[PDB]
């Protein structure tokens, strides 16, 4: 299978400059005639192209940040490097980068293929701040007929994102993590919900597992009922 | 330059039903070797787009039938013959044949699906955060629809205003339905001048209003459990 990684910082200080980087698996660039293009997606906006460079080396920009972009290639280490100066707040998205590939023994036909998971750059003077997690407790106050919910509460880290799988090794059916919202303090919050029979609560153990790469920390909470 | 418009840009529709929606470039969008670069995609809530149809009318592999587009030269269409709950999600039309490479403003795709109430729970704060001098009580509005809900605070019977923040889930893929969180923000010592926490639901699917509620330092009474020695 072929794949691409975006990878890089996640925090940048305005007026700074942004080095992403996009790695490939399951072909060599070094040997390809594909292009490689980077696009970003500020939240709730639509897809902005940003960059594209050919196999050859050649490359177009968007001509209304072409003088803050550069777009490389490093055959070696299989990558291709986005280079981006001057950092602004409206800056702030998620960045992916994008495969053009090409298809037919002859060269007949291209289009882009494979995208990259994106990578979430936040352009802000604050410095990072690992998360707090709290338990949300299951209790007859968080349950209706036959369904229980309990949670975690994801709280006061800088920047986003926070992923929260459940059970050391994720579960799903009733998952529910709730977009972050940044809060007066200045740090984000979020609650990740988990709705199971009501009936089996004291039965099953339930251990939220909250990673926060740009600040390094790992947090496991177990979340139990009950006080009295 | 060179601008991409779609028709329209909320779409709802009820599951099993035709769908239809439209892109338009300014100029001709035409490559001069004369293929025309037109792509759709599909991305779903804080995921990566994925290609549907590519060249306007080829369908990428692992793309459902239903799925098959249309029109040349300025005019687009992307057609799903039988709408299905996985369809959900953020529709964009892209245009790689002219620099800039452009995509469509977006079209959010919506299931009209069947009503549906949410079930409504609370959670008071942990210990430990209250430990730290915050209180966050979080009410949870599960599996609804549709969207519009209405959640109110009440502390020791009044209303709050100002200290509250919701956050919505996208439509479920599977289900069709909704999530919100409605999280009451305090500090320790606010919230230990008030004895009933109560969060109140209001939808287009209760007949009336249902509250839930607790009160702060006290297990409730369906949670009755034995003394110990």
């Known amino acids: 299978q072929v794949t691409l990684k975006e990878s890089g910082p996640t925090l940048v200080k305005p007026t700074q400059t942004l080095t992403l980087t996009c790695t490939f698996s399951?072909?060599?660039?070094?040997?390809?005639?594909?292009?490689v293009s980077w696009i970003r997606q500020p939240p709730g906006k639509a897809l902005e192209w940003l960059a594209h460079i050919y196999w050859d080396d050649d490359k177009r920009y968007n001509p209304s940040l072409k003088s803050r972009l550069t777009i490389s290639k490093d055959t070696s280490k299989n990558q291709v490097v986005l280079t981006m100066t001057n950092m602004d707040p409206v800056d702030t998205a998620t960045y992916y980068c994008a495969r053009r590939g090409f298809y037919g023994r002859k060269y007949e036909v291209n289009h882009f293929d494979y995208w990259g998971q994106g990578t979430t750059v936040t352009v802000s003077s604050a410095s990072t701040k690992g998360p707090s997690v709290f338990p949300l407790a299951p209790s007859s106050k968080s349950t209706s007929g036959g369904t229980a919910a309990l949670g975690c509460l994801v709280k006061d880290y800088f920047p986003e994102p926070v992923t929260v799988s459940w059970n050391s090794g994720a579960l799903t059916s009733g998952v529910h993590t709730f977009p972050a919202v940044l809060q007066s303090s200045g740090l984000y919050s979020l609650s990740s919900v988990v709705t199971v029979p009501s009936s089996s609560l004291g039965t099953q153990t339930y251990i939220c597992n909250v990673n926060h790469k740009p600040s390094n920390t790992k947090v496991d909470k177990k979340v139990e009922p009950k006080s009295c | 330059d060179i601008v991409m418009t779609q028709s329209p840009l909320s779409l709802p529709v009820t599951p099993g039903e035709p769908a239809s929606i439209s892109c338009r470039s300014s100029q001709s969008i035409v490559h001069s070797n004369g293929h025309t670069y037109l792509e759709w995609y599909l991305q779903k809530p804080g995921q990566s787009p994925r290609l549907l149809i590519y060249?306007?009318?080829t369908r990428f592999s692992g793309v459902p039938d239903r799925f098959s587009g249309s029109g040349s030269g300025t005019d687009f269409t992307l057609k799903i013959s039988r709408v299905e709950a996985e369809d959900v999600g953020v529709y964009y039309c892209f245009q790689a044949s002219l620099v800039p490479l452009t995509f469509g403003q977006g079209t959010k795709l919506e299931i009209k699906r069947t009503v549906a109430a949410p079930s409504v729970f609370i959670f008071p704060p942990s210990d430990e955060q209250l430990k730290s001098g915050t209180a966050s009580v979080v009410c949870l509005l599960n599996n609804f629809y549709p969207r519009e809900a209405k959640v109110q605070w009440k502390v020791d019977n009044a209303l709050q205003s100002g200290n509250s923040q919701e956050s919505v889930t996208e439509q479920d893929s599977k289900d069709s339905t909704y999530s919100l969180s409605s999280t009451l923000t305090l500090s320790k010592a606010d919230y230990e001048k008030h004895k009933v926490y109560a969060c109140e639901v209001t939808h287009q699917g209760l007949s009336s209003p249902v509250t839930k509620s607790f009160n702060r330092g006290e297990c409730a009474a369906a949670d009755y459990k034995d003394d110990d020695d």
């Open positions: 399951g072909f060599s660039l070094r040997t390809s005639r594909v292009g």
């Open positions: 060249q306007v009318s």
